[PDB]
Structure formats: structure tokens, C-alpha cells
Amino acid sequence: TFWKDETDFNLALTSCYTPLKNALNGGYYGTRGVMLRIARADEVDFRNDISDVYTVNRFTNSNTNSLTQGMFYQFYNALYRTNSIMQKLEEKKEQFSTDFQNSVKGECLFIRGFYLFQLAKEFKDAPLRLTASQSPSTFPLAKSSQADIWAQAKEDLKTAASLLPITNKIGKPTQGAAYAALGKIYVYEENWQEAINVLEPLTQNPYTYKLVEDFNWNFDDTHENNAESIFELLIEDVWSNTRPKEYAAAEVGGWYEANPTQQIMDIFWKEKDKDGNFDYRARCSVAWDYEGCTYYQRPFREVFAQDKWKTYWILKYQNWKTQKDEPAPPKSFINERAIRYADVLLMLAEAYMNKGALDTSIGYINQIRRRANLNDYSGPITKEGVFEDLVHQRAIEFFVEGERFYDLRRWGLLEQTLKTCDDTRYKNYQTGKSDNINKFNYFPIPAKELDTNPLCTPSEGW
Ligand SMILES: [Ca+2]
Ligand SMILES: [Ca+2]
Ligand SMILES: [Ca+2]
Ligand SMILES: [Ca+2]
Ligand SMILES: [Cl-]
Ligand SMILES: [Cl-]
Ligand SMILES: [Cl-]
Ligand SMILES: [Cl-]
Ligand SMILES: [Cl-]
Ligand SMILES: [Cl-]
Ligand SMILES: [Cl-]
């Protein structure tokens, strides 16, 4: 049996990240999870191949969607694992040094808090399981509110931050990762003072976080664990199906599953850089018909026939400059950067703007602008001005990193942003409007859960 020594507990901990890596069943950072995360904003249109993603993209999904179901249950698999470790550690604490106990608890609570965050971010109100039975329990359990789930997540992440080291092996959390995750929960709750409290210190000694000079190093193989990295996942490192082939054009052997919308391209192109060129972030994120655009190591206009010169293609997290194709199986893996320092800077910008330190906020925005070789912020020194560029910089900075939908949602900008993006998607989205909510703002509790758990009420609007 297991649980015998420090090595066994360390192996258990590593296994708690596996549900984030799951490819086909809704693991959060696996290919299908990524699709669900990017599908609902104005970033991309999906083709109608992977039906459960297409319905999500189009706002026609139901509470039987197998992929959103899978996402739900992956979260609970991970919770079961983290709860089990906590229980086993308590049971066996007498054989472990207090230092080892602290290391395990710190990591385990980081992991539990991160998953709890995502659970209530995606499903709003949901059953809150903080104990693990011998088997994952199918006993009935009424939902907890988003606030209560996030309360647990904050408690976990506070304790984690206090116990974790300033540096760690790649894929293992640091105190900075715990603080940054905690800060994000404060941002989502509009607790601006506490966001500032936990995030501002991350910009100072003894931390070493910095924006990398080359934005693209955040999304490559060779600069994994770079100086901007806060927490990264090694997806291939796991009680074949990877991201880049999905988004590459048929012309280079891919499955062309999604393309950037006109609206998102308009956002990328709006403001040119100090030298008059397109924002380097846009040039790292999408391929389109501009002079010198390359795609899989050929000129754009040579890869694509003339009738396709007006199309748009995703580059972020693709092998678009290291390779000429996307073979299957993949030759290498590009870690998912779950948290990076740009996130801390833009979260501070947002917190300071909302609290009323506009100059401070602008300073943080300008760090982001300067890395991208843009002029500094030139909008009015007002909350509304600074908010307009916050939104704009986040859209460009975190394209297809799974932020845009949740951002638009929490800001109350989603409805108007979909309105300008596509008439039919907007029409479908508006069918979800009832009372003062929209049912499409969160994935519904799956039909399977409502059937198996009679104390669970359906999601509002569903
Ligand atoms: Ca199905
Ligand atoms: Ca520490
Ligand atoms: Ca790698
Ligand atoms: Ca439009
Ligand atoms: Cl449709
Ligand atoms: Cl569906
Ligand atoms: Cl390492
Ligand atoms: Cl490393
Ligand atoms: Cl506040
Ligand atoms: Cl296109
Ligand atoms: Cl909205």
C-alpha cells in the first residue's frame, strides 16, 4: 500500500494536478477545457466539428453537454484527491516532521484553493465537498453559494501562501503563486483593498518576477519557467491529444477548429506601436495578411490561396515558428502558463483604478504598454478612461488564455460585447436572459448531477 513515507505523499501531490491536464474530458488546461474557456467571448468562432464545443460557442448548449459535465466532474476528482491527502496526512502526522507536514499542507491547500476558485468561477453555486470518503461520495449534498466556495478557496490559499517557499521546482507552487491566485479571487469579488495587499508585494524584493523582453517567451517550449512565470503546468507529465494541431490550418496539417473573429482583430489593430507597426503581441498571437507575416515558416500569402488571404489564424501556443506542421503525436509540449506576472501587474492596475489611485494604476498599465513597445496611456485621467485601456490591454495581453469571457462577465460588458460581435450568437445569448440574470453566463449543473444528487437544485435559468 501507499502513504508509507515522504516520497509517497509527494507522488500523491503530483497526481492532484492530473485532472487539470485531462485532454478530452474537460480538464481545465487540456485541449477540450481550453476550448470551453475561450469559446464564449468575442475571440473566436469554432467550426461545427466538436459539437459540445460548438454549442457552447454559439450559446445553444444544454445541461446534458458532455464536455461541461466532464469539466464539472474533473473538478470534483481533484478535490477528492486533495481532501484525501489532507486526511491521510492528519492520520499519519506522527511519522512526519512538522516541516514536511507544512510542505504537504501548503501545496495541497494551494491546489484545493485553485480548483475551488475555478469550480465556482464556472458553475457559480455548486456542492462543496471538503471531505473524501473511502470512495468519492455520491451521497446527496445541497449546493453552496459562489461566495461560500470562494471563502473556502481564500482560506486555503491564505494558509498556502504562508507555508510555501519563495521558489519551487517547475509546476510546484510558490508563495507568489498562492498570493497571485488569492489576489485573483479578491479581484473577482471586487475586494480591491485586499487584492492590493496581497499583490503589491509581488512586485518587490524578495520576489524576482519581471516581464520578459520578448512576449513570445511566455508561449514557447525553450523559455518555459522564465522570469515572468508564476505557475505553469506540464500537461504531458501525468487512484497524444494536444492543443496545437487543433488550431492549425488544414494547409499545415491541422484541424482548423477555430479562427479569430473580426472584432478581436479590430482590437489588436486599433493602436499601432511606437514605430508605427502592429502591436508585437498581435503579431505573436494571430496570423493575417500583413507584410512579412509568416505561418509555419512560410509567407502567409504562400501558405494560403488568394481566396483565403482574408482569413485569421491563431498563433499563441502553436508551433507556428518552430515547425512547418503539427504532427500527431506531438514532438514537444508547450507548458500552459496558468499565472504569469503580467496578470499581477494588470490586476494591480485594476485594483488601484477602482480604489482611486489613477496615477498608480496608469503606471501598472504602462509597464504592460512599454513591454509591447507602445506609447504610454494617453486617455483621460479618469476612472472611465483608465478602465477603457484596462479592458483593451487585457484583451490583447491574454488572448486565448481563458480570461476574456470571465472578464467581460464580471465587468458587466459581456452582453454589449456579444451584441457587436455576431448577430446570431447575440440572438442566441439573449434567449438566456431571464429575471436579472443570463443562464449562459455560467455552465449549468449537469443533468447527471441533478439526477444523482436530489438535494442539488438546478442552476438559475436552467
Ligand atoms: Ca453527449
Ligand atoms: Ca515562504
Ligand atoms: Ca516543454
Ligand atoms: Ca461588428
Ligand atoms: Cl447558431
Ligand atoms: Cl449541449
Ligand atoms: Cl525546475
Ligand atoms: Cl525548469
Ligand atoms: Cl476596497
Ligand atoms: Cl478566418
Ligand atoms: Cl453583461
Cell 520576489: give the residue.
207
> How is residue 347 written as a grid cell?
490586476
Cα(195) to ligand 9 centroid in Å equals: 8
Instruction: Enter the DSSP assignment of 375.
Output: P
For 282, residues 6+ apart whose C-beta sits below 8 A from its C-beta are 268, 269, 396
Nearest by Cα to 120 from 154, 162, 86, 82 = 154
Quick one: how many helices (H) and strands (E) in the chain? 20, 12
69 Cα–ligand 6 center, Å: 10
CA 195, 198, 204 angle in degrees (round to 5)? 120
Distance CA 209, CA 151 (A): 27
The resolution in angstroms reads 1.5
Does 300 carry a binding-site annotation?
no
Cα-to-centroid distance, 344 and ligand 3 (Å): 24
Report whether 276 belongs to an annotated binding site.
yes
Please state, in angstroms and rounded to a whole number, the distance separating the CA atoms of residues 131 and 116.
13
The Å distance, Cα 457 to ligand 4 centre, comes to: 38
- The three-state secondary structure class of 144 is strand
Helix axes 383-397, 341-355, angle to 10 degrees: 170
Strand 298-299 relative to strand 229-233, pairing: unpaired
For residue 318, the CA-to-ligand 3 centroid distance in Å is 12
Residue 418, annotated as binding a ligand: no
For 287, the 3-state DSSP assignment is strand
**C-alpha 180 to ligand 7 mean position (Å):** 19
Where does residue 73 rank: exposed (0-12), middle (13-18), buried (19+ CB within 10 A)? middle
Q: How far apart are the CA of 437 and the centre of ligand 11, in A? A: 9
CA atoms within 13 A on the CB side of 244: 30
Q: Residues with beta carbon < 5 A to ion ligand 6?
A: 55, 61-62, 65
- Is 224 annotated as a binding-site member? yes
Distance 346 CA to ligand 8 centre (A): 25
Distance 237 CA to ligand 1 centre (A): 28
Residue 384 annotated as lining a ligand binding site: no
Q: Could you please report the per-residue DSSP string of 236-264? A: T------HHHHHS-GGGT----EEE-HHH
Residues 6+ apart with CB under 8 A from 191: none
Question: C-alpha grid cell for residue 183?
Answer: 489576489
> CA 149, CA 127: separation in Å to the nearest integer?
9
Q: How many whole angstroms from 44 Cα to the centroid of ligand 4?
A: 13
Question: How far, rounded to the nearest angstrom, does the alpha carbon of residue 93 sit from its chain's CA centroid?
Answer: 35
Cα-based distances in Å from 85 to 88, 123, 158, 253, 264: 5, 25, 19, 43, 43
Q: Is 175 annotated as a binding residue?
A: yes
As a CATH number, domain 1-34+70-240+334-413+447-462 is: 1.25.40.390
Residues 405, 408, 188, 337, Cα dihedral to 10°: 40
Ligand sitting nearest the alpha carbon of 189: 9
**How much distance in Å is there from the Cα of 22 to the middle of ligand 5?**
28
Nearest-5° angle of CA 214, CA 33, CA 248? 55
- Approach to solving: X-ray
Here the cell at position 334 is 508547450
420 is known to lie in a ligand binding site: yes
Distance 428 CA to ligand 5 centre (A): 7
User: Within 10 Å of residue 159's Cβ, how many Cβ atoms?
Assistant: 19
Q: Quick one: cell of 363?
A: 503606471
Q: For residues 318 and 34, is the Cβ–Cβ distance under 8 A?
A: no
* Helices 51-58 + 423-431 axis angle, to 10: 90
Nearest bound ligand to CA 225?
8
Hey, which residues does 340 pair with through a beta bridge? 229
Domain residue extents for the chain: 1-34+70-240+334-413+447-462, 36-69+241-333+414-446
Distance 81 CA to ligand 2 centre (A): 24
Distance from the alpha carbon of residue 182 to the mean position of ligand 6, in angstroms = 32
Ion ligand 10: residue ranges with CB closer than 5 A: 259, 311-312
The ligand that comes nearest to the alpha carbon of residue 413 is: 11
228 annotated among ligand-binding-site residues: no
Place of cell 485541449: 31
**Could you tell me the three cell numbers for 63?**
445541461
